[PDB]
């Protein structure tokens, strides 16, 4: 059985609370059994246990910044799996803070995970600051 893993890099967008990602720089996409779809979700073909993670750095000034790892399974309403919530910095022009989320979850065939934030325009996209991935156990 092949190894199944993905690691994708944060991408800015002028558009939504949903973060966008790209297969570029030092990314991982081991095969077509996981795919980055519409730039916004990792969709797995195979059922099973996966370790799923996201790393978000944001730069804000001054209610908390909240990042949520979410799941949409076929035939189900979307749900929150994990969330992390940090107060805004008062540093000027903005203050950087980072959130890391991760855990082990059973996914169904065709399930997709994505990351939402309270303010996507505050996300830091410099090299390595914000990323999203998974590995099948």
């Amino acid at each position, epitope marked *: 059985n092949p190894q199944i893993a993905a690691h994708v890099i944060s*991408e*800015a*967008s*002028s558009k939504t609370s949903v973060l*966008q990602w*790209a*297969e*570029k*720089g*030092y*990314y991982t*996409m081991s095969n077509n059994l996981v*795919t*980055l779809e519409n730039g916004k979700q990792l969709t797995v073909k195979r059922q099973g246990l996966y370790y799923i993670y996201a790393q978000v750095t944001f*730069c*804000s*000034n001054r209610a908390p910044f909240i990042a949520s790892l979410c799941l949409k399974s076929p035939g189900r309403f979307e749900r929150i799996l994990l969330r992390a919530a940090n107060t805004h910095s008062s540093a*000027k*022009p*903005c203050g*950087q803070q980072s959130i890391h989320l991760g855990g082990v979850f059973e996914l169904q065939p065709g399930a997709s995970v994505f990351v939402n934030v309270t303010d996507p*325009s*505050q996300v*830091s*996209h*410099g*090299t390595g600051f914000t990323s999203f991935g998974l590995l099948k156990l």
Partner: antibody
Amino acid sequence: QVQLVQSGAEVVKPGASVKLSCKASGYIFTSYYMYWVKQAPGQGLEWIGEINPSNGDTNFNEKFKSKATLTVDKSASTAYMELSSLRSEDTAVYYCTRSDGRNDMDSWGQGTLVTVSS
Amino acid sequence: DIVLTQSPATLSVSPGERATISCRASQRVSSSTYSYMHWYQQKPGQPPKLLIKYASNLESGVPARFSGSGSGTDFTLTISSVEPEDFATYYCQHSWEXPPTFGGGTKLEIKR
């Protein structure tokens, strides 16, 4: 129409600093990253760095991290680049340019010529 | 950093002739869905103007005679039939990683 208007030419001495402006109109200034790009005499293009006008977050090319300070004034829809410790090798046209998704550079300022000479 | 080498340095063509220029990257800048390579036109005394984004997408407002193609390390820009306003220098630029970098340019020159 999306438009970027830069400040006029500078002629300065070595050791001086200059502060260039880039006034944006025709779109929501906070929704797009702003890049600054250098083009030297007879020269090619080099990216200096970027600013997120929504929060002031910046990232730089290692080659320019010492040389360039990037800021914005949201209310005036204006981006600024300060160049410090100027030397003759900094003589160039400097551009601001809007970036769509921090990928392509889809609208450019007219350029500001900076000539440094004793 | 990634190095972009454009060929030829100068391409001489007439109006009504097809022009194709190429851009070779020091590493691949394509993945599953997209190629992170873009193309620009620049005339003396003026800013560059975006022509083609993500290797093959015509920028809004750019005439239909411009197209792009390629993948991995190798990209081309084609002007299907040159018009007098097209004589200019053309640049490729990638957006794979920090810093974005540009090629050295190809001058599209008037053949005589």
